[PDB]
Structure 1
Amino acid sequence: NLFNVARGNLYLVQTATNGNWSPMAPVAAPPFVRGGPNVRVVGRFGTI
């Protein structure tokens, strides 16, 4: 992190929060993981 490189994955949820916020160290729980319930992995090329 001293060399402007972050480890770990990246979330793109929205939140309309007014209070404190920190993308570096989010105190709250992650919204989901890869093997979790109702979550699904996209295939190759993201075909809509």
Structure 2
Amino acid sequence: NLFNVARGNLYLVQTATNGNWSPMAPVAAPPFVRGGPNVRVVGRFGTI
């Protein structure tokens, strides 16, 4: 971080709050980790 280089991953969820939103230091467990119940990955190509 002291060099502008966050680790971990990046979540994209539409949380529309009003309180102290905190992108960096996230309170609580991250919603849906990899390999969680019904959490499919994207096949290499990513085709739709």
TM-score (norm 1): 0.90
Gaps of 5+ in 1: none
Residues matched between the structures, number: 48
- Per the alignment, in what secondary structure is the counterpart of residue 45 of structure 2? helix
Identity %: 100
Q: Which structure dedicates a bigger proportion of its chain to helix?
A: 1
State the TM-score, normalized to the length of structure 2.
0.90
Spell out structure 1 runs of 4+ moving beyond 4 A: none
Rounded to whole Å, the distance in 1 between the matches of 2:28 and 2:11 is 13
